Amino acid sequence: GSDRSRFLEGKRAVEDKNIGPLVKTIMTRCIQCTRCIRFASEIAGVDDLGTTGRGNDMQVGTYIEKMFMSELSGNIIDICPVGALTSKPYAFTARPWETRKTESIDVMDAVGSNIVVSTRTGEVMRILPRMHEDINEEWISDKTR
Amino acid sequence: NLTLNFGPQHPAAHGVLRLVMELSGEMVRKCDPHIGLLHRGTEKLIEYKTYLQALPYFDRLDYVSMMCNEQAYSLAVEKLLNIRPPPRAQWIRVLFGEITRLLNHIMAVTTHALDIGAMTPFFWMFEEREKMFEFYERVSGARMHAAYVRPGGVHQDLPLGLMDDIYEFSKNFSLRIDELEEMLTNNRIWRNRTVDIGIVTAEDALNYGFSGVMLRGSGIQWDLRKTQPYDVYDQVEFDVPIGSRGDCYDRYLCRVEEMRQSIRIISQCLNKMPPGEIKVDDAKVSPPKRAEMKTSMESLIHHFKLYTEGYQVPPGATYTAIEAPKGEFGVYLVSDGSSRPYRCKIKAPGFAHLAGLDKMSKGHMLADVVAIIGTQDIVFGEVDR
Amino acid sequence: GVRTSPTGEKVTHTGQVYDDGDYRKVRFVGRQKEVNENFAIDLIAEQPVSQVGSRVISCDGGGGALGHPRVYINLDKETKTGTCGYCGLQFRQQ
Amino acid sequence: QLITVDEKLDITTITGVPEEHIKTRKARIFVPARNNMQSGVNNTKKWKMEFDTRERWENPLMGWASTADPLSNLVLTFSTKEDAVAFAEKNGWSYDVEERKVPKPKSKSYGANFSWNKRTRVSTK
Amino acid sequence: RPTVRPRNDVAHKQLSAFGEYVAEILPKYVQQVQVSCFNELEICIHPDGVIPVLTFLRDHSNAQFKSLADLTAVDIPTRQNRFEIVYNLLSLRFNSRIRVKTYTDELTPIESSVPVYKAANWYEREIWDMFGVFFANHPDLRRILTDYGFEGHPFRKDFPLSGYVELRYDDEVKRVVAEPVELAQEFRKFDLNSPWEAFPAYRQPP
Amino acid sequence: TSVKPIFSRDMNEAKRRVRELYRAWYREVPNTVHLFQLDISVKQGRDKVREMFKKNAHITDPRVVDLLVIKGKMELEETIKVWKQRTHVMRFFHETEAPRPKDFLSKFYVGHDP
Amino acid sequence: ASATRFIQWLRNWASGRDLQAKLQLRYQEISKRTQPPPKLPVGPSHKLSNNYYCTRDGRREAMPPSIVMSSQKKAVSPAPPIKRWELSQDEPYL
Amino acid sequence: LHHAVIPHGKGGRSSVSGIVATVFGATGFLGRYVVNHLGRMGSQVIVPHRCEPYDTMHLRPMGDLGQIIFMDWNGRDKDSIRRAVEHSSVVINLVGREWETQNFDFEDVFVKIPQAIAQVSKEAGVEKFIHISHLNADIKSSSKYLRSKAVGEKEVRETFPEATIIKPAEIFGREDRFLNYFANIKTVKQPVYIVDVTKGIINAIKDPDARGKTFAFVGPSRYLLFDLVQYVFAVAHRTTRDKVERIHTTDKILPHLPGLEDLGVEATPLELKAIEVLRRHRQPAKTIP
Amino acid sequence: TYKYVNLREPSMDMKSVTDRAAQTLLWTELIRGLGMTLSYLFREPATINYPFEKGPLSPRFRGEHALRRYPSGEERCIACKLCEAVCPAQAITIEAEPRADGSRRTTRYDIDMTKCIYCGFCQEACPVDAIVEGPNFEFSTETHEELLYNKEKLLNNGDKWEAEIAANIQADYLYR
Amino acid sequence: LKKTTGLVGLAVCETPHERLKILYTKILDVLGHIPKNAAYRKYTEQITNEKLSMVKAEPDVKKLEERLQGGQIEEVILQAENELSLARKMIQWKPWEPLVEEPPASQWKWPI
Numbered sequence A: 001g002s003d004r005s006r007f008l009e010g011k012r013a014v015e016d017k018n019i020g021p022l023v024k025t026i027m028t029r030c031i032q033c034t035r036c037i038r039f040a041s042e043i044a045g046v047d048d049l050g051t052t053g054r055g056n057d058m059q060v061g062t063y064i065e066k067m068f069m070s071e072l073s074g075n076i077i078d079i080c081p082v083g084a085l086t087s088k089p090y091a092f093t094a095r096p097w098e099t100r101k102t103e104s105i106d107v108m109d110a111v112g113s114n115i116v117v118s119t120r121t122g123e124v125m126r127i128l129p130r131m132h133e134d135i136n137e138e139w140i141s142d143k144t145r
Numbered sequence B: 001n002l003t004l005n006f007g008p009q010h011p012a013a014h015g016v017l018r019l020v021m022e023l024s025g026e027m028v029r030k031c032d033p034h035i036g037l038l039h040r041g042t043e044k045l046i047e048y049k050t051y052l053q054a055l056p057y058f059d060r061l062d063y064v065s066m067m068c069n070e071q072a073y074s075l076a077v078e079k080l081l082n083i084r085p086p087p088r089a090q091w092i093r094v095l096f097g098e099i100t101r102l103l104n105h106i107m108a109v110t111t112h113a114l115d116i117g118a119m120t121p122f123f124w125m126f127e128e129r130e131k132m133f134e135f136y137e138r139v140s141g142a143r144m145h146a147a148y149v150r151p152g153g154v155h156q157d158l159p160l161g162l163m164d165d166i167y168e169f170s171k172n173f174s175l176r177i178d179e180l181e182e183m184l185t186n187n188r189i190w191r192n193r194t195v196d197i198g199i200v201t202a203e204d205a206l207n208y209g210f211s212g213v214m215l216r217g218s219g220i221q222w223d224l225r226k227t228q229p230y231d232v233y234d235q236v237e238f239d240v241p242i243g244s245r246g247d248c249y250d251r252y253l254c255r256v257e258e259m260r261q262s263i264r265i266i267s268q269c270l271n272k273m274p275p276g277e278i279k280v281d282d283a284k285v286s287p288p289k290r291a292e293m294k295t296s297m298e299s300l301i302h303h304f305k306l307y308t309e310g311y312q313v314p315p316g317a318t319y320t321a322i323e324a325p326k327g328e329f330g331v332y333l334v335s336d337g338s339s340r341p342y343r344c345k346i347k348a349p350g351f352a353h354l355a356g357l358d359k360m361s362k363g364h365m366l367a368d369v370v371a372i373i374g375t376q377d378i379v380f381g382e383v384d385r
Numbered sequence C: 001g002v003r004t005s006p007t008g009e010k011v012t013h014t015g016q017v018y019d020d021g022d023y024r025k026v027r028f029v030g031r032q033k034e035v036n037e038n039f040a041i042d043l044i045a046e047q048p049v050s051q052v053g054s055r056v057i058s059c060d061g062g063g064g065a066l067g068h069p070r071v072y073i074n075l076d077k078e079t080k081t082g083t084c085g086y087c088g089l090q091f092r093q094q
Numbered sequence D: 001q002l003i004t005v006d007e008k009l010d011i012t013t014i015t016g017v018p019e020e021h022i023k024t025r026k027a028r029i030f031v032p033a034r035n036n037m038q039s040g041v042n043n044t045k046k047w048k049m050e051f052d053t054r055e056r057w058e059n060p061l062m063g064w065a066s067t068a069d070p071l072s073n074l075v076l077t078f079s080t081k082e083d084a085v086a087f088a089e090k091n092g093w094s095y096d097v098e099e100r101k102v103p104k105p106k107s108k109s110y111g112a113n114f115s116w117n118k119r120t121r122v123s124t125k
Numbered sequence E: 001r002p003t004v005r006p007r008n009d010v011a012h013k014q015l016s017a018f019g020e021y022v023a024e025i026l027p028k029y030v031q032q033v034q035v036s037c038f039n040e041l042e043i044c045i046h047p048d049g050v051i052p053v054l055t056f057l058r059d060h061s062n063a064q065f066k067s068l069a070d071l072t073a074v075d076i077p078t079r080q081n082r083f084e085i086v087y088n089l090l091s092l093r094f095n096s097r098i099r100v101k102t103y104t105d106e107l108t109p110i111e112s113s114v115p116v117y118k119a120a121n122w123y124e125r126e127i128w129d130m131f132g133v134f135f136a137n138h139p140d141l142r143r144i145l146t147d148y149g150f151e152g153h154p155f156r157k158d159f160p161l162s163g164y165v166e167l168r169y170d171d172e173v174k175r176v177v178a179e180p181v182e183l184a185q186e187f188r189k190f191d192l193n194s195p196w197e198a199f200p201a202y203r204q205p206p
Numbered sequence F: 001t002s003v004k005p006i007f008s009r010d011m012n013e014a015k016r017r018v019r020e021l022y023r024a025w026y027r028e029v030p031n032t033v034h035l036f037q038l039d040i041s042v043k044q045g046r047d048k049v050r051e052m053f054k055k056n057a058h059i060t061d062p063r064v065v066d067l068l069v070i071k072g073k074m075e076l077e078e079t080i081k082v083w084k085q086r087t088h089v090m091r092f093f094h095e096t097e098a099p100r101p102k103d104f105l106s107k108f109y110v111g112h113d114p
Numbered sequence G: 001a002s003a004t005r006f007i008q009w010l011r012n013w014a015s016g017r018d019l020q021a022k023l024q025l026r027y028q029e030i031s032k033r034t035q036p037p038p039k040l041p042v043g044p045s046h047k048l049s050n051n052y053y054c055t056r057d058g059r060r061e062a063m064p065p066s067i068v069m070s071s072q073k074k075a076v077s078p079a080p081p082i083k084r085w086e087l088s089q090d091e092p093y094l
Numbered sequence H: 001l002h003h004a005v006i007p008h009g010k011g012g013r014s015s016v017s018g019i020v021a022t023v024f025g026a027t028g029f030l031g032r033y034v035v036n037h038l039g040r041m042g043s044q045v046i047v048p049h050r051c052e053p054y055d056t057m058h059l060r061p062m063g064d065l066g067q068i069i070f071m072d073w074n075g076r077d078k079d080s081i082r083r084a085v086e087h088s089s090v091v092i093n094l095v096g097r098e099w100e101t102q103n104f105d106f107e108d109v110f111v112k113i114p115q116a117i118a119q120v121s122k123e124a125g126v127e128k129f130i131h132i133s134h135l136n137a138d139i140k141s142s143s144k145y146l147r148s149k150a151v152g153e154k155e156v157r158e159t160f161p162e163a164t165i166i167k168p169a170e171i172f173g174r175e176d177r178f179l180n181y182f183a184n185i186k187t188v189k190q191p192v193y194i195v196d197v198t199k200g201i202i203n204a205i206k207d208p209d210a211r212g213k214t215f216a217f218v219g220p221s222r223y224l225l226f227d228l229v230q231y232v233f234a235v236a237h238r239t240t241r242d243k244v245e246r247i248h249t250t251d252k253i254l255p256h257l258p259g260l261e262d263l264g265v266e267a268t269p270l271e272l273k274a275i276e277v278l279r280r281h282r283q284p285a286k287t288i289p
Numbered sequence I: 001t002y003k004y005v006n007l008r009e010p011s012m013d014m015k016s017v018t019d020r021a022a023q024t025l026l027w028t029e030l031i032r033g034l035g036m037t038l039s040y041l042f043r044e045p046a047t048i049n050y051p052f053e054k055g056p057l058s059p060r061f062r063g064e065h066a067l068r069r070y071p072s073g074e075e076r077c078i079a080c081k082l083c084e085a086v087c088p089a090q091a092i093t094i095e096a097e098p099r100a101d102g103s104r105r106t107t108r109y110d111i112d113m114t115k116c117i118y119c120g121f122c123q124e125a126c127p128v129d130a131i132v133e134g135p136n137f138e139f140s141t142e143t144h145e146e147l148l149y150n151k152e153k154l155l156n157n158g159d160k161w162e163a164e165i166a167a168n169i170q171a172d173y174l175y176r
Numbered sequence J: 001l002k003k004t005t006g007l008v009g010l011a012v013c014e015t016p017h018e019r020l021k022i023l024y025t026k027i028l029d030v031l032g033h034i035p036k037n038a039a040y041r042k043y044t045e046q047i048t049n050e051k052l053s054m055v056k057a058e059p060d061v062k063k064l065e066e067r068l069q070g071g072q073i074e075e076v077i078l079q080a081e082n083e084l085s086l087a088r089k090m091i092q093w094k095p096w097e098p099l100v101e102e103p104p105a106s107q108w109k110w111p112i
C-alpha cells in the first residue's frame, strides 16, 4: 500500500459484541473479510456468525446476544487477519517480536496436535497451532489453546 | 636495546595504547603498538540491531567527529535503499560536517601541542569547542552523540535562531585560529619538535593505506570532497591544503589551514541553506511527523513498523567512504534483505595510520614518537571498534 | 490508593508487596520503598462522563497533536459508557 | 601442491568452544513453522539451527530473566538442510533434523459455494 | 523524482567495460564479475589468484589501484567455504574503486597480500583474530584486537554475542580472574522479519 | 579429498612440529614461573602443559594439528614476550571456580543441566 | 566588554589585534532563548492526487547486480584519467 | 522453602544460592574471605559494620548488584542486632579483637557480644548460627583472650543450642596476624589456612549434619614454634603480653571433635602457601608426628 | 583547487638574512608569543560560577527519563512496547496486563540507566508522549542499584518534573 | 627544469624523454616473451605503443604531460617502471591460462 493518507473525513465506529470468555471483540477493527463467518459455518459446523445490515454499516456478529462457545472457537482468533478478534486471556501481555517460539506437541488429548509455545523471559505466554497436514491441519482445540 | 613493554620487570600501566618499544640509547629501533584495549565488538553488536538502532554506534567510533561518522553510515544505507535525502537535509549535513571538522581539528591540534608541553592553546580553543557543543545540543539535545544525521536526512529541523548564532560564532573564529598560530606556527621550539619529524613519502603513504592529511601532507592531491563528492559538496568552493615536506609540521599546517577552509564552507552553507523538508518524504524509510502519526491511519502503521521492525534494505553490499576529519572513513555494509545489517565492517583511517607508526618512527628519538602519534590523529574508539 | 499491608509495607499501584516470609524486604531496612502515591486508576475514575449528542464521538486526549492518536468511539449501547482506549475518558449519548 | 585427507572434517578443537557446550548440547535443524497469526509465508523459506533451551531464573534485584547459557540466543540460517547438517557435524554438535512441512495443494472452486446437490453449498456470503 | 537516488549509466557502462577487461586478462583466476545497481565493480576470483590479481590491479597502467582502502572477511555458515575475503581498492589516477573477493574455510590458508600492500599487515591480523583465517607468509600473524589468551574468533556467526567467559577482580587470589559468563539479564532476542516479501526483484526460484 | 596444506603434508610431519612446540613450552615453564612470580610450582606448570597437549591427542587431520601448533606458538610467544600479564597465565588453572561434579546424582540435585 | 579603556589598550597592543571587535565571550548578539513557534513545510509527496507510491518507490527500483562475466579491441581504464587540480587563486601560497 | 530462596543458576555471581547470611565482623581478616565466598555463588549478604563505610569498600565488588547490603550496628545495642538478622536464614559471628581497648575488653567481644547476637538470633527465628571460637579456648588458660573464648563458647552453646561452633588454630594468610606477625619481629603449633577455614564455614552452612556440632579446624601438620619461625625468615629472606601467651600455647589435640575433612575440606600445607604470604616481605620446617 | 601551506622561498639578501639573525639571537618570535599570553591575562575569563550559574541548554536536551500523565492524572503509557523495541541498548523492560478497570497498562516498566545511552529514541517512538527524557542531568548516585529505575521511580520523576517537561514539549513539538 | 615534483620522495628527472624511451622499449621486449594471443600482451603493447609515440612526437615536457594524462612526467616514469615490473611477474604467473578451478555451486550466491 501507499505510505500516507488522503482521507479527510471522520471514521466509522462500531459497537463491541460479546461472544464468550475466550474471544474479545473490538469490531471497529473488523475489515469484513468474513473469514470468521466461513470458519464457524464450515469448520466448526456452527451457523451463529453472520453479517447484519448493509453497505458501510454491515456488521459481523451474532445479531442477538449469544456466546460462540465451540471446542474449536478459539481458531477464529488466528484466522482473523486483524485485531478484531483476539485472545481474551492473552490480552496485553506480550508483543510478537519479543516472544521465543518453541515447537512442541499437545497433551490435552490423544490427537497429538502440533503447537508452538510462545515464551518470554522464561514464562509461557500463549499456545498457537503449528501446521501439520496429517494431524490438526492448522487448528487446535480450545482446551489445547 | 632497552625495552618498554609494561609488565614484570617494568612496573607501570599502559592505558589506551600499549606501545612496546625497543630503544638503542635515545633512538627508537622498533615500535610495536598493542591495541584492542578499547575493542568492544561494535561490528558484532551491529548485527543484532536494526539499521536505525545501529546508528548511535557510529557516534561512538571517532568520538570527536560524531556527526561525520553518522553521515558516512547514512550515505551507505541511503545508497542501498536507493533513496536520497532532500536538499535542505544535505545542506544541513554539510554545515554540521564542517562544524564537526572544526571540533576535530581543534582537538587534534591542541592536544597534540599539550602532549609536548604547550598547554595553553588547549584552553583557549576548548571554549570554542564548548560553543560548538551548544549547536549540537540545540539541534539534537545532545552535546556529543547527537544521533542527528540518519538515513533519509536528519532527525529534526534547525530551531529558529540557530543559524544566526552559527554566523556569530563563525564571524570571530578565524581570529582564534590566528591566536593559535601566533603561539605555534613560528615558534622555534614548536618547529624543532615537528619539522622533519615522521617524514613519509608519497608512495609509502599510498601503499601503507594512509588517507586524509596523512596523504596531503606529502603532496598528494587527493580529497574525497573534491574527487568523490557526496551530499552537496560539489556546490561549495574551498581549497585543499597541500604539504611539501611530508613531515609533522606540514601536516600541522594542513590541519590549521583546513580549519580556515571549513569556516569558508560554513559561510556558504549559511547563505545557501534552502527551504524544505529535512527527511525523505517516503514514510517507508523515514518516520512521519508526529501530528500525522496521530491522525492518519497510514502514518500510524508506518511509525509503528519503522520503530519496531525497521525498514528492510534490499540485499546488497556497498563500500561507502567520506572525507572524515581524520581521513577516509568508510563502511563495507552488507544487506541480506532484512531490517538488520548482515555485516558492517568499519574502515577507520586511524587503523592504517597507526599500523604505519613503526615505519614513520624509524630514526627518531623517544620523544618524537609523541609527535608522530599526535600527527596521525589517533582515536582508539575507531581503531579498535 | 496507597495501602499498607499487615507487615506495614505499602502496596504499589500494581499490587506489589513482599509477603511476610520474603527476605527481599531487607533491602528497605534503613532506607525506603519508592511508591508513587498518585494511582492513575483512581484519578481517571474521578473524571465525569461527557454528555454528547451523537452516536459517534472522537477523542484525541486533548491538546491536539500533544495527545494520543485520534480514535472514534461508538455510543450505541445504553448499559455502559464509551471509554477511550488511550486516555480512559468516558462518553455517554444524550 | 595438494594433499590427500580422507578423514572427516572436525574443528571442535580449534573453535574455542568449551567442552560443555559441544557434547552436552542438542542442535535442532528445522524450517520454522509459519506463524499462524499471519498468512505470509516468507519466514518459512530457510533452514534454522537452534539449541536446546536451558534454565532462566529471576534476578533477585529486579526480577529480570537471568541466564547462564551462552548459546541461548544463537540461531543460524542455512539454505538447505544438507548445509545445516554439515555445519553441525564439523562443529561436533548432536542434532535432530525435522523434515520441511509444505502445505499440500488444495482444490478451490468458487462455484462450489452454490452447489445444486452437494453439501459444499454455503448458506451466507 | 525527489525521493529516488538517480542512476548513473555512464559510470555503469564504464565499470562493466573494465570488468570485462580484467576478466579477459586474468582468466586463470576470475570466476565472476558484476556491477551493482549503485555502480560498484566486484571481481570474484579463485583464492590462488590473490597475489597475481592484486599485483596486476596495483601495477597495471590502466588500473593503478595504489591504495588498499580496506580488507575484511564475511562469515557465511551455509557456504562450504564459509569465509569470504573482500579487498576494497582505490585508484587515484582514475578516481575509481574496485572490490576483489575470494573465499576460504576454517583450514585452508590464504596467501598474505602484505607484499602487494603494506596496509594489509594489520588488516590480515584482524581477520585472523576475528575470523580465524590463517594467512600464509605473513611477517607477524597474531591477535590484534582480542584479549591475550582469548579462545575463539568472535566475529564468526556461531560465536555467541556475549562470549563464554567474563572477568572480575577476585579478592581471594588478588588478581582479575575469568569465569563462565552469567548475565543478570539475558539479551532478549527479537524476531523482527516480516512474513511478507518486500523485494520481488530479488526473489530466489523455488 | 584434495586440500591445500597449512605446513605439514602428513601426520608424520605434523607430529614433529607438535614435539618441537612441546619442548619449547617445557623449557619455558621455569622461566614463566619465575618471571611472573607465580605461586604454582614448576611441576604444576609442566603438568598443565602436558594436560593441554593430551587434550588433543586424538586428532588425525594434519591441517587441524598445524593450526593447534600455530595457536600454541602464538600463546608461547605471548608468554615469552611478557605480552600476557600474570592474570592471563593463571587463567589456565581456574583457581576461583568451584569444582563442578560430574556424576549423575550430583548434577540431579543441583539443577537441570546434563 | 566591561574592561577599562587602558586595559583594552594594553591587551590590544600585546596581542597585536583589535580584540574588542571580535570578543570571544557572547553578549547581546545571541538569539533569544524564546523563539516564535515554527511552521515547517512539507515534502513533495504531500499531494492529494497524482501521487501513487509505485511511481516514487526507491527501494523497489533497486536491482540485483549486473553479471558481466561468470565462469559458469581497445584497452580501457575503470574511468577516464583524473584531471589535474588547478592552484587556488584565492590564495595559492601561505 | 520460600519461593524467593530456592537455588537457581549455575552457582556463579548472578546465580541464587538461597543463602541469606548476616555476617557480623565481616570487615576483618576472616570476614572478607567469608563474604567473598558467599557472594561468589550469589548469596544475599547483610554486613553489619561498626566502622566507616570507607573501610567496607573492599567488600562491594564481591557480590552482584543488590547482594551485599550494609547496616550500622552497635554491639551493645540489641535493636540494631535485631534489624540485621530478622530476615536472614543463617547468622555468622566473626567478632573479636586480638587486644583490649578502653571501650571493649575481651569479655565484651568474646562473651557479651556473641551471646547478644545468639539471643537476638534465637528470638528472631534464625535457623542456622555459626560461631567462631578458638582451638585453645580454656578457662585454665594463661591468656585472657583464650579464657574469654571458653566462657563465650559455653554461653553461645546454651543460648543457641543448634549453633555450629568452629574452633580454628591460628590462621595463616595474606592478611593474617601470624606469619606476618613473625616476619615483623616447647611450643607446638598446628596452623590452618584461611581459605580452608572459609570453605569449612561455607560447607557447614550447607550441611544439616553440622547443626549443633563443634568442629576443630587445624592444618595438616604440627610444627615446633621455633622451627616454624625459622622457616618464615628463610622464606622471607630475613605485640602484647597476651599475644605472646597465645603464640606460646601448644595447639590442643582434640580427636573427639570433627574437623575440616568432615566438612569435605582438605587442609592445605603451610609450605604451599607460605611463599604467597611472605613474598611481599622480600627449606622446610621439621614436622612433629 | 588546492594551495600550498609551506612552499616559500626565504630571501637571501643581506637585509633578510640579518632579519633572521636578529630573530635567532634576540628571540623575537618567542617574545611575540609572550605577548599573546599576556593579552589573555587581562581578558575576562570564560568561567561560570557553578552551581550558582548553569551552562545554557535548549528545550531538546536529553536528560533523566520520566513517565508522564494526562491532565486528568491518567497514565499516558499504554504498554505498547514500541519504546522497548527501539531501545538500542535494550535498557527498557516492560510487562503489562489488563488493569482492574480493563485499561491496557504496564505492571513493569524499568530502565537500566547504566545500559541507557540517552539517545532519545524511546521518546521519538512513543505514540502518546508517555516516556520522555527530561531536563534533569544532576542525578548522580552513590550506588549502582540507585540507577536501576522501575516504574515507581519513573512515575515519581514525571510528577516531580512535569511543570518543566510540559513547557519544554510545548516549545519543541512543532519541530516533531 | 622544474624545482620539484611536489611529491615527497619523488625526484625530478633531468632527461624524462630518454628515460621513458628506455622504459617503454624494455616493456615491449618483455611482452615479446608472452604468448601472442594473451590479452595481457595485446592490451599492454597497445597502450605502451600509444604512450611511446607521444614521447616521440612531443619534445616539450609540459605539453607531453598534457598528452599523457598521467600527472607529472616523473609520475609517468614511475608508472612505466611498475608496468615493467608487472610484466616480468606475469610471465611467471601466466594468468592467460584457463581457470584453475570452478567455485562451489553457491559460492557467489547472495542473499543465501
Ligand SMILES: CCCCCCCCCCCCCCCCCC(=O)OC[C@H](COP(=O)(O)OCCN)OC(=O)CCCCCCCCCCCCCCCCC
Pocket (backbone or CB within 6 Å): B188, I024, I025, I026, I027, I030, I031
Ligand atoms: C660593542 C661590542 C659588544 C660585544 C658584545 C655584543 C653582544 C651582543 C650581540 C649578541 C647577542 C647575544 C644574544 C645572547 C642570547 C643567546 C642567544 C641564543 O643563544 O639564541 C640561540 C638559541 C638557539 O636558537 P636556534 O633557533 O635553535 O638556532 C641555533 C641552533 N643551531 O635560541 C635560544 O636561546 C632558545 C630560546 C630559549 C628561551 C625560550 C624561553 C624564554 C623565551 C623568553 C625569554 C625572554 C628573555 C628574558 C630576559 C631576562 C632578563 C633578566
Ligand SMILES: NC(=O)C1=CN([C@@H]2O[C@H](COP(=O)(O)OP(=O)(O)OC[C@H]3O[C@@H](n4cnc5c(N)ncnc54)[C@H](OP(=O)(O)O)[C@@H]3O)[C@@H](O)[C@H]2O)C=CC1
Pocket (backbone or CB within 6 Å): H024, H025, H026, H027, H028, H029, H030, H031, H049, H050, H051, H075, H093, H094, H095, H096, H097, H098, H104, H109, H132, H133, H134, H135, H168, H169, H170, H171, H177, H178
Ligand atoms: N584469625 C585468627 O588468627 C583466629 C581468629 N579467630 C576468630 O575469628 C574471628 C575473626 O578473626 P579475625 O577476622 O582475624 O578478627 P579481625 O580482628 O580480623 O576482624 C574482627 C572483626 O570484628 C569486628 N569487631 C571487633 N571488635 C568489635 C566490637 N567491639 N564491636 C563491633 N565489631 C567489632 C571488626 O570490625 P572493625 O573493623 O569495625 O573493628 C572486624 O570486622 C574472631 O572472633 C577471632 O577470635 C579464631 C581463631 C584464630
Ligand code: SF4
Pocket (backbone or CB within 6 Å): A029, A030, A031, A032, A033, A034, A035, A036, A037, A060, A079, A080, A081, A082, A084, A085
Ligand atoms: S475474520 Fe476478523 S476481519 Fe474478518 S470478518 Fe471476522 S472479525 Fe472481521
Ligand code: SF4
Pocket (backbone or CB within 6 Å): A029, A081, A082, A083, A084, B301
Ligand atoms: S495492529 Fe493491525 S488490526 Fe490492530 S489497529 Fe493496527 S492495523 Fe488495525
Ligand code: SF4
Pocket (backbone or CB within 6 Å): I083, I086, I087, I088, I089, I090, I091, I092, I111, I115, I116, I117, I118, I119, I120, I121, I122, I123, I133
Ligand atoms: S534514551 Fe535510548 S538507550 Fe535510553 S532508554 Fe531511551 S531508547 Fe533506550
Ligand code: SF4
Pocket (backbone or CB within 6 Å): I076, I077, I078, I079, I080, I081, I082, I083, I084, I094, I125, I126, I127, I128, I129, I130, I131
Ligand atoms: S512509554 Fe510509550 S512507547 Fe513505551 S510502552 Fe508506553 S506507550 Fe508504548
Ligand SMILES: [K+]
Pocket (backbone or CB within 6 Å): A076, A077, A078, A079, A080, A081, A082, A083, A084, A085, A086
Ligand atoms: K486476530
Ligand SMILES: [Zn+2]
Pocket (backbone or CB within 6 Å): C059, C060, C061, C068, C084, C085, C086, C087, C088, C089
Ligand atoms: Zn482519549
